[PDB]
């Protein structure tokens, strides 16, 4: 029961599931840290109170209790920080949940424009996440970060995991290839080597060194390896979704003739071909190297007409355009004249031939 052809809401979630993983790993790191901190401080407090119990069996007890308080309040502040980060991550997921609940409400109910607005939001959310990925950092902020902040939808895109990847992968290829990548391995050696992936090895060899083994392209292969491990760690789906959508859309409406080889302006904008997105003015180089289309139904205008120019237009649209040109004082017509847009010409009404396209 879709409106026109949009798929069921169960499909959009599976379409972009990276939006529900990169917050989740951030969420799980928090618990995996705040459990280790408690397991490291609880034994400390226990062994510490063992001393007091021994000492009772001598006003040093007040000193010991004061040290106990001075130790406990630090745990209190630590938990406070952890909770104020945990709640923020939860909010981040909940916003993206209600985003799709909005589409479900719209789809369960004219309303076509109330859905076009939603697809406008769904396109901005996506241009933002492509721009904040590959656009050089200024200092850190990018053009993507600015767009996300100033479109009032910063919650629905991380823009910090992606930005962190951009920082590392531009330092590994610029700035004399000064490497902070070691500062990323050292904080993540517990889970990276469980997968047993060869990243510390190549980083160590490159650090030692600084002719393929001395060539520059080792920088590029190192960068590619780091991106592979990062993306497979988080779930970022290493192809820009904007690129995927374009690579299908442009080949989905590239029909059989898109690259077909003051009064003039109005005439040549009165056509319905000077609107085609795929062959407009700046997508021709994109669309040159892409397949065309498949169609098993000849869709055509209803009542066609041929005139000596060689091309067939319509029966009524020509009449309405002739009247329009009559009511704006651009041309000088007469009772039976008719005008042809392409290669502007005037033909009599009886130089018109009906056609039957089977």
């Amino acid at each position: 029961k879709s409106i026109f052809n949009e798929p069921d809401v169960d499909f959009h979630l599976k379409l972009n599931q990276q939006l529900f993983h990169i917050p989740y790993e951030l969420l799980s790191k928090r618990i995996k840290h705040t459990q280790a901190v408690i397991n490291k401080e609880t034994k400390s407090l226990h062994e510490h109170t063992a001393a007091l119990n021994q000492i009772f069996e001598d006003e040093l007890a007040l000193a010991k209790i004061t040290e106990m308080i001075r130790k406990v309040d630090h745990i209190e502040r630590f938990l406070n920080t952890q909770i104020k980060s945990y709640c923020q991550i939860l909010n981040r997921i909940k916003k993206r949940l209600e985003f799709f609940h909005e589409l479900k409400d719209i789809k369960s109910q004219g309303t076509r424009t109330k859905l076009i607005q939603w697809y406008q939001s769904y396109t901005n959310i996506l241009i933002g996440d492509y721009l904040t990925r590959n656009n050089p950092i200024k200092y850190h902020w990018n053009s993507g970060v600015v767009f996300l902040k100033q479109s009032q939808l910063d919650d629905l895109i991380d823009y910090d995991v992606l930005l962190e990847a951009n920082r590392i992968s531009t330092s590994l290829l610029h700035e004399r290839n000064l490497l902070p990548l070691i500062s990323w391995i050292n904080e993540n050696k517990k889970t990276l080597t469980k997968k047993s992936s060869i990243l510390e090895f190549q980083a160590r060899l490159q650090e030692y060194i600084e002719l393929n083994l001395l060539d520059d392209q080792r920088w590029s292969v190192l960068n590619d390896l780091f991106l592979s491990d990062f993306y497979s760690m988080y779930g970022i789906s290493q192809n820009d979704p904007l690129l995927i959508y374009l690579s299908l859309g442009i080949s989905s409406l590239k029909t059989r003739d898109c690259l077909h080889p003051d009064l003039q302006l109005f005439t040549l904008h009165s056509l319905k071909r000077k609107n085609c997105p795929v062959c407009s003015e700046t997508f021709k180089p994109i669309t040159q190297a892409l397949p065309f289309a498949h169609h098993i139904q000849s869709q055509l205008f209803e009542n066609p007409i041929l005139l000596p120019n060689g091309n067939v237009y319509d029966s009524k649209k020509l009449k309405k355009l002739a009247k329009t040109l009559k009511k704006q004082n651009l041309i000088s017509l007469n009772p039976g004249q008719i005008m042809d847009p392409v290669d502007m010409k005037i033909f009599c009404e009886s130089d018109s031939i009906k056609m039957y396209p089977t």
Partner: protein, 340 residues
Amino acid sequence: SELLDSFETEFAKFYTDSNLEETNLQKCLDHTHEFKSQLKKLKAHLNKHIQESKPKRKRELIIEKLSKSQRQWDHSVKKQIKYVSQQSNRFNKSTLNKLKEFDIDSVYVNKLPKETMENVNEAIGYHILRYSIDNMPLGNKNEAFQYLKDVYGITNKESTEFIEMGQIVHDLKKGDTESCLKWCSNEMSNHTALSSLKFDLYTLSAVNKELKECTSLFIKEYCAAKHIFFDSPLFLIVLSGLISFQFFIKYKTIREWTTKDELPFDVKLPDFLTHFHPIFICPVLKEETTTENPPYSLACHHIISKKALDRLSKNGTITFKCCPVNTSMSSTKKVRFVML
């Protein structure tokens, strides 16, 4: 449908009854707070006892109280953190069963060439310049072109018109007409719609359901007057891309790059993205007439493709079928369908 509801129900378990703002670690924070308070009370009592001891069933209770406090604190903290860890590890067994059955990136075939990434960066420029121009702090009339060029990036001469559009639209949004009136009265084109716009905004000069119906009309009549576009050439393309996924995955699952030509599985998409170029299917050979093999009309007022015509007649012999009263290539003509 079912997945979204079964997702919200599982997700709500992270929160307590309030549905918001009371996360599970509040238990740990409360327990540590209570533990500290108990130690402070015990410290005060011991201080008082020693102070008054200056010249026993008392100490044998305070020491046990300290022991009890530490047992309760560590036991409760461990139990609560264990429960929250298990809950977070069980929510994965509902974010995994569904959202890891697609692998979006497996659909990327016919990769977009690496040389043409400037053109994408101009389509993005145009879309940002058109749909979301007013939602930015710009400032002066022309001291914002530099800001555009400096932060985001500048498109071709189709930026001055959009700066003016954003300026007038924002001015009209603040309930201050008498600039849109001037703009309308200066461009005197099609008188009809312009006069209709003049009357509508004049009515606005005399609400929350009227602004949304006048800004749109002005936008339409400005885009149709300065000859640019009304919908971005990128939004429509992303729409068609979103529509073709279902058919592509259906073809993929039937199957178990493609003849360097027309991709298969004949995706169908709504009318307002199809009424651009006319597509015609030959009635005798069943093939879409291309730039080569263009359709011919054969004096019977029928249309057949040229190749089928040149196999109906070897070199054009008078064989005349299709009203059996056709004729050979002395009375046949070229056609081109224009969707006027």
